[PDB]
DNA sequence: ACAACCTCCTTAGTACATGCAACCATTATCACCGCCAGAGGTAAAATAGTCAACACGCACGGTGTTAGATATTTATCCCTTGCGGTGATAGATT
DNA sequence: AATCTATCACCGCAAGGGATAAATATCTAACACCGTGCGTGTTGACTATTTTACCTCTGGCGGTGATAATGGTTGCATGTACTAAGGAGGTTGT
C-alpha cells in the first residue's frame, strides 16, 4: 500500500536488519547553524547576539559616557537569487543594532538619572539562505564548509622521542583557545620542568608559579605530599598513608602490614597503588636504599649533645643517620624523588630560575615579546594577563570551559569562558603526574574531543574579534563629546562590515564555489567536514593528523567521502544519520534494551558514550517466544569490536548507513569493494552531469528518492490536496477544511526553475510530474529536475555492459560506447556559461559598442543587435561576436614615399582590431539570456528595455491567472459556508460580488459566519495590491560599477556539450575512465538474446582494482532492466490481465531474505499498470549498504531477465557471427558522464598572448597561453642529445621576440631554419641581477 | 623573488618556460596508428599549423591576402590541406607525458588527422609513457626548423629508442591487453574444439569446428642468423596451436619457430623482441614489435576472458582448515587467562595463526582455482590446468597477482594499522 | 698563550612538477578659503552663415500596362534495370 | 611470357522505368508612364558661425588657522623537519 504519486513509481528494498528510523533532511550544519547565528535567543551564548553581549554596553574607560545595547536585527533586502546571478551581486541584507545612552545627576542628589536616549544604527551585512539550504554570492553558490578542530581549553600530548642530544622523550600540557594567544608546559632537554609563554623561547616552569603568586612551601602544599621518617627501639622506620607508594625505582626489598611488598628491580610506578589501599599500611621499615636520595624538608638537631645534624634542602648520609640514631628529636620531613609519584622537577627547577617574585615573573615576560625595549612597569603585567583575560585576546565559549574542566576531571558545572589565575595549577599537576603512567594522552581524535564548527559558528568566530580590533574611531571619540547632547551613533563607519561579511561566504578560507556538478554533490557539499584552518592545518603544513582515520569515525564520519591525491582526508562528509550535541561532539542513533531484549525504544548517543555502554553490532537476531537466536552477540565500543553472551548488552546500531555519507550511501555492494575504489565511487557519482535523456539507478540503496528531495530538486506536496493547474514552470493545488487555515483561500503553489549559470557551468532546469485533477498526499512528488526520472534520482543512464577486453580501446577503465548512444543523443550534457564586457568612464563618460570589423571574418558578425549584441534564441559557435567592443588601430606614418597602398588606393575604411567579445574556438550552443547595466541615474539601454517587456510578459500574464486562482479559492469558501444551508447558492456563483449583499441564509449563526467573511474580504485582497512592479525595477535597477565604469554588458550560452571521445565516464563502483572510441552497433559484442551490447570495459584491469561491486551492479542491473524490456514486449500482445499482473507483480513479489515488500496484491489492477511506464526504464531497487541483495538473490531475481543465471553468457561478435572460447561476464550497469570535459579543453596554440614582464608567452586557457616545457621535459632532450629541438623551445618558440617572429615566417624563406637573436628571459635576468646589486657581463671565443 | 626560491627565473622562465606552437588534451587509445604515428583533430592541426597557412597562401595565390584569408583558414577550407600534406607527409610531431622523470615521457611521431578534441596515442608507446586514461592529459610540440625535424626522426622517434635505459628490455612494447591476445593465441586446452587439430585460413573460424587453443603439430623447418650473417638452418616436430602457427606469419623467420612453442604472457613476450634486437637488426625488430599489436587486437576479444561471480571459485575444504586455525587460537586465548602466556606474546601467537590460516586456505585455493574437476574417470574428470580468468590474468601477466587471487578466491587475510 | 673541545645557545637556509577555475573591495584626512589669473563670460563684428522666403527644378516611386519568363502540364525519349546464357576469367601450367 | 579450361559469375541482350523537354499556360517582374514632394535654385532677413573686444565666470593654487590639546602604538613572522654555521666561555689540554 503506497501513495498517489507512487501509483507511477515504487522502489524494491531487499535488506535484513531492524531499522526503526530513516533519512533526516541532510542539510542541518548549514540550516540550524544559520538560524542560531542570526536568532534573538533570550539566554544563550552563541551567534551575533552573543558577540554584541560580549562587548556592549561599552561603559567608557574615560568614565563620562556609555554606548549601551539591546539586540541585533536583519531587514531591508533588495536583490533576490535571480538578480544575484543575472546582475550577480551577493544575496545579502543589512545588520542593524539597537543602541542606547544614559547620563546621571551632574547637579543634584535625589533623582539619580537625568538623560536617556535610544535608537538603531547600521553595523554590517549578512548573506541570505534558501529552503534548499544554499546561498548566492558573486553570480555563484559560494558556500561555507564546516570545520573539525581540537576542542578549545587545554590538551595533554606526548612528544615521546623527537630529536636533539638525547632523542628527547617528552610529555606536555598545551593551551588552545577558541579565540586568543597561547601557553605551553613541558620539559627541557636536560629534564627541568619548562614552559613556552605564547609558544616563544624557553622559560623555567617556576616563573608562572611566581606570577600566579605562590612561595616555595605553598608550591610544596599545592603539588607534594611530604615523606616522613623515624628511628625506634633498634631500627630506622618510615611513616605512611596507604597510597604513598607510586614511583619508586626499587633497587630494594620490603615487607609491610604482614607480607612482602617490594623486591629488587620492580619499579613501583603508580599502576602499583592498587597493592596498598586495600591493606591499610601506615608504617614501613626499609634498606638504606630508601633513606638517602630523599632531601630533608626542614632543619634538624641533636639534644644528646646540644647541636645540629642538618639543614633544609639537604641529603641523608651514613654519618647523618648515625647522628639521627642519637638525636633525641627522632623525626624527619622529606621530599618525593621517585619520579611521577610526585615529579621532583618542580623542587629542582625552583633552583634553576633567575626570577624571584611576581614583578620579575612579568618583566621577564615583557622581554620575551620586546627584546631591547624598557619594561614599562604596569604594561609588564598587562602584556601577560591580557594573554588570557583581555576584551579581544581570549575566549573558550562555555563549550571550551566545559572541555577544560572535563580534561581536568573537575566537578564544577560552574565557571567562565576566560581561565582563572588558579585553574592553571591543575594543568601543571597533570604534567607533573602523567610522565610515565598515572594517566596518558588526552584521547585527541575522539569525535567528542575533536569538535565540529558549523557554518554559523565559523561566522560567529569573526564577530568575536572584529568588534574588538576595528571600532577605533568610535572607541576614541566616545571619550570627548558632551553626550548629554550627542548620541549612541555619531562616529560609526559603515564601509568594512558590508564586504567583510557579504564575502565571508565568497572569498573566505572555507567558502569555495559549491560542487554544483549534480544534486548529490551539492547535497553532500552542504555537510562537508574540513580538517583545515585555525583549529586544524593545511594540505601542505600538515602530516597525517589531517588525512588518516581513527575508530570513533564509526556511525559519524565516513572515511571514503573525500577528494583524492594529496587532498586525501583533508575534507570529509557527515554520515546520513549523524548529528551533534550542544558541544559539537558527534552522535549516532541506537536501539536500546528493556526487561531482556534490544527493543525499538530508539535513542541517540555521543562518541564518548559509544566508549561507555555495550552496543551490539548489526549482525544480531531475534527469536520465537524467547529472546535472541544470536547466542554470542557480537558487540562494539569506541569503534573497536567484541563477542559477548545475551546477558551483557545495553544497545545496538539502528542501521548500517548510519556509518555512511551521501555519495558512499548510494553504492549497493560495498560488501564486495576495496576502500581505494569505494573512494572513487564516492566521487564519480559527484563528478557526473545532467544529460538530455536522463535515466534512474535501477539497482540501488533507497537513497535514490531521499537525494531527489534533500535539496528540493524534486517539488514535493508540503501540504497536499488536489492538483489545479500544471505548466512547464508553474504548479498550483487546492486544499480542504481538514487543514485549511482560519482565513485562507485553500491553496498551495509549487512553481519551478528554468535555465541559469552554475559553479561548474552546468545547466539548471525543472519540469512537472503531475496533472490537472490528481489527488496527492502530504509527501507526494510534483516535479523533476536536472538529474531525475519522473519522481526518483537519475545522475546518468543505464547501459548494457560486456566485461571483456575489446580491439584495444578499453585497457584501463577506459570505455567503448555504441553509435546507438549518439543516435539516441545520450550522454550529451547541457551547460550554461557567462561572458561579459564594459564601457569605461571616459572624460565625456561613455565608450563605444558596435559591429564594424570590415574584411576580417564577416559571417562571424551576422547575428547582432543595433548595440552589437546577439539575440536570445540564436545559435552561436566557435567565433561569433557576443558584445561589440570594437577598437580602431592607427599606423599613421603616411609620408610621400611610405603611403604604400591604403591611404590613397583602396580599403579606405576602418582597420578595427578583432577585439569585440567572441565565442571561444571550441564552444557551441544557444544564446539564452542578455543584459546591460549602468549607474542608476541613466535609465537602462534599449536592449535591456526590450528585455524588461520580455520579463514583464511573464508576471503580467501569471498575476492575471493568480488573481483568478486566488478568488476561485477564497469565494469558494464563502460559497461553501452558504451551501451549508442556503443550498440555492449556485444562483450566486454567477454574479458580481457586490450583489451577494441582497441575501440571507437561515435563523441560525451560519448567517453571521457569512456576514463576518463578507466584512473580512475587502481587507484580505490587499495582498495582491502591489505585485507587478516588485519585479520590474530590479531589471531597470542600476548599480554603481566604481569610478572607471559607466556601463557593463552580458551574454549567456546554453553550450550543448555532446557525446564525444576523450570525454570521461564512470559507474557507481569506482570504474572511471575516458571514452576511447564510438563503435557501430555491430562493431561490438552481442548476447544470447541475439542483440548487441551498448558499452565494453576491460576486466583484465579489475584484479588490480580489488573491487567486485561493479560486477554485482552489472548482474543485478541485468535483472532490473530485463524486467522493463520484457514489459515493453508484454504490453503489446497483453495475453490476459492476470498475465500482465503475473510478470509486473512477480518482479516485486520474488524474494526470500527481506524486511520490505512492494506487495502489489495490496494495490489494484490499474495501479499495477500506471506503474508499468516507469518499469520500462527498469525495476527500481533498494539495499542499505552492508544489508544487501547478495549473489544468491541476484541468481533468483535473474529469472525475469531469463538470460543465464551465471551472469556469464555465450557472447558473440556483430562483425563476424562468431561465439567466443568461453562464456563471458555481461549485464546492464548504471553509468555516468563526468565534468572533466575534453569538450571545454581543446587548448592548442600557434602564437597569441605574451607576458610584457618577460616577453615569454602568457599561460592559461583564460589567457589563450603557451604551455610549460618544464625542467623535467628538458632532461629528456638533454638525455636524448637533442639540442636543436631543445634550443627551439628556449628561444624561437618563447621569450626571444626576434627568434619567434623570424622562425614563424621562415616558411616564406622556404629555408625553414632558426634565426634566433636573444632569449629575453635571460636578458631580463642580466638586469634583475644588476638591480639586486650584482655586476654581470660577457666575453668572446 | 625573481631568483632565490621556486618562482625564480632559473626554474619558472629559463630551465623551464611557456612555449608557442604547442598544446594539451586528454589521451585516447589509437590502435590503427602505426608505431611512428599519432592522431590529432583537424582544428588542432589547423591551430598548430597556422604558420604554414598564414605563410603559404601568400606564396601560391590560394587566397587574395592574409587579411581576406580569415574567411578560409578558420573555415578549414580545401586550400589548407595541400598546405598541410606539404607538412604531414614527412613531419615529426613531438609528444609529451609530464612530469618527465624519464626520457620515454617525451618521444616523436607523425600526424594523422581525426575528429574530436582529444589526442590519439599508439598502444605500444602507451606503456613507455605510463598513460593513465582517467582524463589525465598529454602535450604536443611542433618542430619547425629543418634541423629539429632531422634530429626528431633520428633521436626521439619511437621506432628508434625502443628499450629500457636501465638495462635493455623493451618499454615501447606489446601493451596492456595486447599480451592477453598473444597469451590466448599461445595457450592450449583439453577437448579444445580440437584436442589435436589444425588448419590455416581465418575463414575456417566460420567452417564449424576450430579453435586458437586447438593443438596443432608440424615439422616446421626453422632458421637462426649467426653473428657473421649466415643462417643456421634447423627442423623439428612441434606441439603447438593454430595461434602459435599464425604467429609464424608475424615472426621474423631468421629466428626459429621453436621460440613460439610456449605461452606468450608479459612474463615472456619482451624476450622474443629482445632476442631479435640481440641478433637480427633494427627494422626486423621494429616490424616484429609493431605487427604484434594488431595481431593482439584481432584475437584478445575472442578469448572471452572476464571477471564475474563464477570466475570467483572457492575451496570447499576451507571448512576443514577452520577446524584447525580458529581452534588453535581458542585454547591459546585460554592459556593466557589460566597463567601460561602474558598479553604480549599472545598477540604474535595469534597473528601468526591468522597468517597460517590465510596461507593454509591459499594452498586449497590453488587446487580449486587450477585443477579440481574431480568425478572419477573413465568417461569423466577432465582434471586439466583450468581456464579460470582471474588465474589467467596472473599467468598472462596481464594485471593479476597472488595477493589479488587470495582476496578473490579464498581469504583477504591481514592488514596494517596507521 | 693559545687551541678546540664538552655542552645545549640561537641563528636561519631550503622545502619537486604540470594545469584549470575566479571576482577585484578597504582607509579618512578640517584643505580649509584667500587671492587673482589670463580667464570665464558675453556683448558687439570678425570668419563670413543660417534657413526661411519665393522661387526654382528634379528624382523617385507607385500606379498602371506591358512583356516574357517560368513552372506547370503534356509526351516523348533513353538509359537503366534485372535476369539469363554462357562468358577466357583466376591463375596453374607450359 | 605465352597457353587455356573451367570457375564464379558479367554479360547476353529482354524488358521497362524515369526522365526531361516540348508545348502550353500560368505566374511575376520590368518598365514607362504619371504624380507627388522634396532638397532644385537664388534671394533675403534673420539671429546668433565666428572673431575680437570688453566686463567681469570658473577654477588655477598658494597659503597656513591658536581658550587648549605635549609617554605612542602594534598584534600575531612561528610552532614542523631537517641541519649547517656562528656564536659563547670555561677548561683540559695543543
XYZ file of N, CA, C and O (backbone and C1' of nucleotides) in Angstrom, chain D residues 22-89:
476
model
P 13.147 20.583 -76.620
O 11.813 20.808 -77.499
C 11.066 19.715 -78.007
C 9.612 19.698 -77.523
C 8.859 21.003 -77.790
O 8.021 20.876 -78.924
C 8.359 20.010 -75.626
P 7.388 22.170 -79.654
O 6.081 22.474 -78.759
C 4.978 21.583 -78.763
C 3.952 21.913 -77.674
C 3.362 23.317 -77.823
O 1.984 23.207 -78.136
C 4.109 22.844 -75.551
P 1.054 24.494 -78.432
O 0.503 24.864 -76.962
C -0.328 23.961 -76.252
C -0.276 24.185 -74.738
C -0.938 25.498 -74.319
O -2.236 25.256 -73.808
C 1.131 25.023 -73.118
P -3.316 26.445 -73.639
O -2.897 27.103 -72.227
C -3.121 26.410 -71.008
C -2.374 27.036 -69.827
C -2.808 28.475 -69.540
O -3.718 28.513 -68.454
C -0.371 28.180 -69.530
P -4.384 29.892 -67.936
O -3.319 30.402 -66.831
C -3.220 29.738 -65.579
C -1.829 29.810 -64.939
C -1.498 31.175 -64.338
O -1.926 31.302 -62.995
C 0.286 30.384 -65.718
P -2.157 32.755 -62.331
O -0.652 33.232 -61.992
C 0.078 32.620 -60.940
C 1.595 32.784 -61.082
C 2.088 34.189 -60.742
O 2.486 34.280 -59.387
C 2.947 33.439 -62.862
P 2.486 35.690 -58.599
O 3.766 36.443 -59.231
C 5.080 35.967 -58.989
C 6.114 36.564 -59.950
C 6.490 38.007 -59.605
O 7.901 38.132 -59.610
C 5.724 37.798 -61.884
P 8.663 39.407 -58.978
O 10.136 39.295 -59.634
C 10.366 38.924 -60.986
C 10.137 39.999 -62.055
C 10.698 41.387 -61.727
O 11.710 41.701 -62.666
C 8.584 41.465 -62.834
P 12.700 42.965 -62.495
O 13.564 42.920 -63.861
C 12.994 42.695 -65.143
C 12.249 43.868 -65.792
C 12.852 45.258 -65.572
O 13.449 45.698 -66.780
C 10.438 45.231 -65.538
P 14.274 47.083 -66.894
O 13.129 48.137 -67.316
C 12.476 48.032 -68.571
C 11.052 48.598 -68.551
C 11.010 50.126 -68.513
O 10.696 50.658 -69.785
C 9.300 49.061 -67.159
P 11.018 52.196 -70.152
O 10.143 52.436 -71.488
C 8.771 52.084 -71.602
C 7.752 52.953 -70.852
C 8.069 54.449 -70.757
O 7.266 55.192 -71.660
C 7.061 53.529 -68.748
P 7.400 56.797 -71.806
O 6.259 57.335 -70.796
C 4.887 57.183 -71.120
C 3.993 56.950 -69.898
C 3.723 58.213 -69.086
O 2.646 58.973 -69.599
C 4.166 56.313 -67.678
P 2.551 60.562 -69.330
O 2.102 60.629 -67.782
C 0.801 60.220 -67.389
C 0.688 59.995 -65.879
C 0.709 61.301 -65.083
O -0.587 61.596 -64.593
C 2.278 59.641 -64.215
P -0.964 63.050 -64.002
O -0.377 62.983 -62.500
C -0.958 62.121 -61.536
C -0.125 62.027 -60.255
C -0.022 63.366 -59.523
O -0.784 63.285 -58.332
C 2.145 62.267 -59.799
P -0.976 64.538 -57.331
O 0.278 64.374 -56.331
C 0.405 63.223 -55.511
C 1.839 63.016 -55.019
C 2.263 64.073 -53.998
O 2.426 63.458 -52.733
C 3.954 63.659 -55.687
P 2.391 64.304 -51.360
O 3.911 64.829 -51.232
C 4.979 63.931 -50.979
C 6.346 64.573 -51.234
C 6.559 65.863 -50.428
O 7.853 65.952 -49.863
C 7.010 66.194 -52.721
P 8.241 65.165 -48.514
O 9.849 65.130 -48.582
C 10.533 64.340 -49.543
C 11.479 65.156 -50.429
C 12.328 66.171 -49.645
O 13.703 66.174 -49.977
C 11.431 67.097 -51.607
P 14.734 64.974 -49.691
O 16.051 65.463 -50.488
C 16.009 65.716 -51.885
C 16.157 67.202 -52.239
C 17.575 67.746 -52.002
O 17.974 68.632 -53.034
C 16.001 69.132 -51.024
P 18.470 68.102 -54.465
O 18.281 69.390 -55.411
C 18.544 69.309 -56.802
C 18.074 70.547 -57.573
C 18.719 71.842 -57.089
O 19.835 72.154 -57.903
C 16.321 72.068 -57.455
P 21.107 72.948 -57.313
O 20.594 74.474 -57.306
C 20.472 75.192 -58.522
C 19.701 76.504 -58.369
C 20.316 77.465 -57.354
O 21.329 78.265 -57.937
C 17.907 77.346 -57.181
P 22.280 79.216 -57.047
O 21.376 80.536 -56.850
C 20.930 81.284 -57.970
C 19.886 82.335 -57.580
C 20.502 83.461 -56.750
O 20.219 84.703 -57.368
C 18.625 82.410 -55.619
P 20.922 86.076 -56.895
O 19.955 86.572 -55.705
C 18.629 86.996 -55.979
C 17.710 86.933 -54.755
C 18.100 87.926 -53.661
O 17.254 89.062 -53.703
C 17.423 85.745 -52.806
P 17.637 90.436 -52.946
O 17.144 90.154 -51.434
C 15.763 90.077 -51.121
C 15.492 89.468 -49.742
C 16.081 90.284 -48.591
O 15.072 91.105 -48.026
C 16.646 87.915 -48.436
P 15.389 92.218 -46.899
O 15.286 91.368 -45.533
C 14.049 90.813 -45.116
C 14.212 89.818 -43.963
C 14.687 90.485 -42.670
O 13.709 90.293 -41.661
C 16.107 88.615 -43.331
P 13.892 90.838 -40.151
O 14.622 89.598 -39.422
C 13.961 88.351 -39.288
C 14.929 87.168 -39.191
C 15.636 87.090 -37.841
O 14.902 86.263 -36.958
C 17.093 86.558 -39.712
P 14.913 86.514 -35.366
O 16.355 85.945 -34.931
C 16.643 84.557 -34.984
C 18.136 84.275 -34.796
C 18.683 84.855 -33.482
O 19.638 84.031 -32.840
C 19.988 85.511 -35.321
P 19.288 82.654 -32.085
O 20.698 81.868 -32.140
C 21.249 81.429 -33.373
C 22.529 82.176 -33.769
C 23.720 81.863 -32.857
O 24.828 81.395 -33.604
C 23.351 84.243 -33.072
P 24.914 79.866 -34.097
O 26.218 79.869 -35.044
C 26.654 78.677 -35.680
C 28.071 78.787 -36.254
C 29.104 79.199 -35.201
O 30.243 78.358 -35.245
C 29.021 80.754 -37.057
P 31.301 78.312 -34.026
O 32.267 79.569 -34.345
C 33.215 79.487 -35.398
C 33.727 80.846 -35.884
C 34.626 81.561 -34.877
O 35.992 81.237 -35.061
C 32.932 83.032 -35.772
P 37.067 81.430 -33.871
O 37.301 83.031 -33.866
C 38.053 83.648 -34.900
C 37.785 85.149 -35.047
C 38.344 85.988 -33.899
O 39.671 86.398 -34.169
C 36.075 86.600 -34.431
P 40.726 86.668 -32.978
O 40.234 88.087 -32.389
C 40.390 89.277 -33.144
C 39.549 90.432 -32.593
C 40.031 90.909 -31.221
O 40.572 92.216 -31.305
C 37.627 90.456 -31.281
P 41.397 92.884 -30.087
O 40.224 93.492 -29.156
C 39.497 94.642 -29.559
C 38.166 94.813 -28.819
C 38.322 95.047 -27.317
O 38.461 96.410 -26.964
C 36.594 93.425 -27.806
P 39.126 96.843 -25.556
O 37.958 96.509 -24.492
C 36.773 97.288 -24.435
C 35.606 96.545 -23.774
C 35.714 96.465 -22.252
O 34.958 97.489 -21.632
C 35.125 94.322 -23.257
P 35.128 97.840 -20.065
O 34.273 96.676 -19.347
C 32.863 96.603 -19.497
C 32.275 95.305 -18.934
C 32.343 95.241 -17.404
O 31.081 94.858 -16.881
C 33.317 93.302 -18.418
P 30.766 94.828 -15.295
O 31.206 93.332 -14.877
C 30.526 92.197 -15.388
C 31.402 90.939 -15.419
C 31.492 90.211 -14.075
O 31.172 88.845 -14.259
C 33.658 90.578 -15.027
P 30.662 87.920 -13.045
O 30.768 86.444 -13.677
C 30.663 85.284 -12.870
C 30.647 83.995 -13.707
C 31.154 82.805 -12.889
O 30.444 81.626 -13.225
C 32.725 83.452 -14.625
P 30.408 80.357 -12.230
O 31.801 79.610 -12.544
C 32.017 78.978 -13.796
C 33.453 78.475 -13.966
C 33.886 77.474 -12.890
O 34.335 76.281 -13.513
C 35.431 79.335 -13.078
P 34.701 74.946 -12.682
O 36.261 75.166 -12.337
C 37.235 75.282 -13.362
C 38.531 75.927 -12.854
C 39.196 75.114 -11.737
O 40.596 75.033 -11.936
C 38.894 77.374 -11.102
P 41.406 73.650 -11.783
O 42.930 74.155 -11.630
C 43.657 74.689 -12.728
C 44.439 75.960 -12.378
C 45.407 75.797 -11.205
O 46.731 75.566 -11.646
C 44.055 77.805 -11.012
P 47.690 74.508 -10.898
O 47.895 75.179 -9.444
C 48.624 76.385 -9.289
C 48.504 76.979 -7.881
C 48.982 76.028 -6.776
O 49.859 76.684 -5.876
C 46.942 77.035 -6.220
P 51.422 76.877 -6.205
O 51.868 78.008 -5.146
C 51.508 79.369 -5.325
C 50.714 79.946 -4.148
C 51.444 79.826 -2.809
O 51.791 81.116 -2.333
C 49.099 79.235 -2.672
P 52.895 81.334 -1.176
O 52.018 81.234 0.176
C 51.167 82.300 0.565
C 50.011 81.858 1.465
C 50.442 81.312 2.826
O 50.621 82.348 3.775
C 48.853 79.862 1.766
P 50.901 82.047 5.335
O 49.429 82.163 5.979
C 49.184 81.768 7.316
C 48.440 80.428 7.397
C 48.916 79.595 8.588
O 48.087 79.800 9.714
C 48.540 78.256 6.594
P 48.649 80.509 11.046
O 47.339 80.601 11.979
C 46.256 81.463 11.669
C 44.906 80.741 11.744
C 44.613 80.146 13.124
O 43.296 80.455 13.538
C 44.425 78.501 11.409
P 43.013 81.541 14.690
O 43.484 80.765 16.022
C 42.767 79.648 16.522
C 43.412 79.096 17.798
C 43.579 80.181 18.867
O 43.037 79.830 20.125
C 45.690 79.145 18.279
P 41.453 79.879 20.392
O 41.369 79.847 22.003
C 41.887 80.928 22.763
C 42.173 80.572 24.225
C 43.071 79.344 24.392
O 44.144 79.649 25.265
C 40.896 79.050 25.449
P 45.659 79.199 24.946
O 45.615 77.611 25.213
C 45.413 77.099 26.520
C 44.959 75.637 26.499
C 46.011 74.711 25.887
O 46.424 73.778 26.870
C 43.842 74.497 24.797
P 47.777 72.919 26.720
O 47.296 71.653 25.846
C 46.415 70.688 26.396
C 45.820 69.757 25.336
C 46.870 69.024 24.492
O 46.866 67.631 24.740
C 45.056 69.934 23.164
P 47.710 66.974 25.949
O 49.230 67.111 25.431
C 49.694 66.345 24.333
C 51.223 66.309 24.255
C 51.883 65.750 25.520
O 52.763 64.678 25.243
C 52.902 67.783 24.802
P 52.197 63.207 24.928
O 53.542 62.321 24.892
C 54.180 61.896 26.082
C 54.042 60.377 26.187
C 52.824 59.923 27.004
O 51.725 59.563 26.176
C 54.747 58.525 27.252
P 51.626 58.169 25.370
O 50.648 58.521 24.138
C 50.146 57.503 23.284
C 50.943 57.380 21.980
C 50.541 56.160 21.145
O 49.642 56.415 20.080
C 52.941 56.248 21.465
P 48.049 56.235 20.247
O 47.921 54.716 20.785
C 47.839 53.595 19.916
C 49.116 53.342 19.109
C 48.964 52.198 18.102
O 49.014 52.687 16.778
C 51.099 52.201 19.206
P 48.127 52.040 15.597
O 48.841 50.613 15.359
C 48.419 49.425 16.003
C 49.492 48.344 15.854
C 49.004 46.944 16.226
O 48.429 46.226 15.155
C 51.186 47.399 17.138
P 46.841 46.279 14.891
O 46.506 44.775 14.423
C 46.487 43.689 15.334
C 47.882 43.078 15.493
C 47.918 41.565 15.268
O 48.197 41.222 13.926
C 49.363 42.321 17.074
P 47.053 40.610 12.971
O 46.832 39.134 13.589
C 47.620 38.017 13.209
C 49.072 38.074 13.695
C 49.805 36.748 13.457
O 50.483 36.583 12.222
C 50.427 37.833 15.523
P 51.356 37.736 11.502
O 52.400 36.879 10.627
C 53.316 36.003 11.251
C 54.480 35.673 10.315
C 55.061 34.290 10.616
O 54.774 33.372 9.580
C 56.630 36.023 11.147
P 54.710 31.791 9.875
O 56.258 31.421 10.113
C 56.672 30.126 10.511
C 56.680 29.912 12.033
C 55.515 29.056 12.526
O 55.787 27.671 12.459
C 56.074 30.836 14.062
P 54.959 26.729 11.451
O 55.285 25.246 11.993
C 54.723 24.739 13.191
C 55.503 25.240 14.409
C 55.678 24.196 15.509
O 56.821 23.404 15.242
C 55.114 26.382 16.386
P 57.248 22.150 16.165
O 56.044 21.087 15.939
C 55.343 20.825 14.729
C 56.077 20.455 13.432
C 57.439 19.758 13.516
O 57.397 18.460 12.954
C 57.331 21.403 11.777
P 58.526 17.371 13.337
O 58.751 16.587 11.942
C 59.098 17.264 10.745
C 60.545 17.099 10.265
C 61.640 17.068 11.338
O 62.519 15.970 11.171
C 61.996 18.855 9.749
P 63.672 15.640 12.257
O 64.990 16.267 11.565
C 65.535 15.677 10.397
C 65.989 16.705 9.356
C 67.363 17.297 9.653
O 68.432 16.477 9.223
C 65.828 18.932 8.768
P 69.796 16.418 10.079
O 70.942 16.592 8.950
C 70.919 17.594 7.944
C 71.445 18.976 8.345
C 72.631 18.972 9.318
O 73.747 19.665 8.791
C 70.965 20.571 9.916
P 74.798 18.927 7.818
O 75.869 20.089 7.505
C 75.627 21.067 6.504
C 75.667 22.509 7.017
C 76.952 22.868 7.766
O 77.785 23.649 6.928
C 74.943 23.805 8.761
P 79.304 24.020 7.332
O 79.114 25.360 8.209
C 78.653 26.553 7.598
C 78.122 27.586 8.595
C 79.184 28.078 9.577
O 79.770 29.275 9.094
C 77.008 27.676 10.615
P 81.162 29.845 9.682
O 80.690 30.647 10.998
C 79.943 31.848 10.880
C 79.274 32.268 12.192
C 80.261 32.563 13.325
O 80.185 33.935 13.669
C 78.403 31.181 14.033
P 81.168 34.616 14.754
O 80.374 34.397 16.142
C 79.114 35.009 16.366
C 78.320 34.337 17.490
C 78.946 34.537 18.870
O 78.196 35.521 19.556
C 78.399 32.202 18.425
P 78.867 36.638 20.508
O 78.926 35.899 21.940
C 80.045 35.145 22.369
C 79.583 34.097 23.384
C 80.625 33.796 24.460
O 80.305 34.486 25.654
C 79.561 31.794 23.580
P 81.420 35.329 26.459
O 82.182 34.186 27.300
C 81.568 33.572 28.422
C 82.283 32.290 28.864
C 83.806 32.443 28.973
O 84.339 31.724 30.071
C 83.243 30.611 27.630
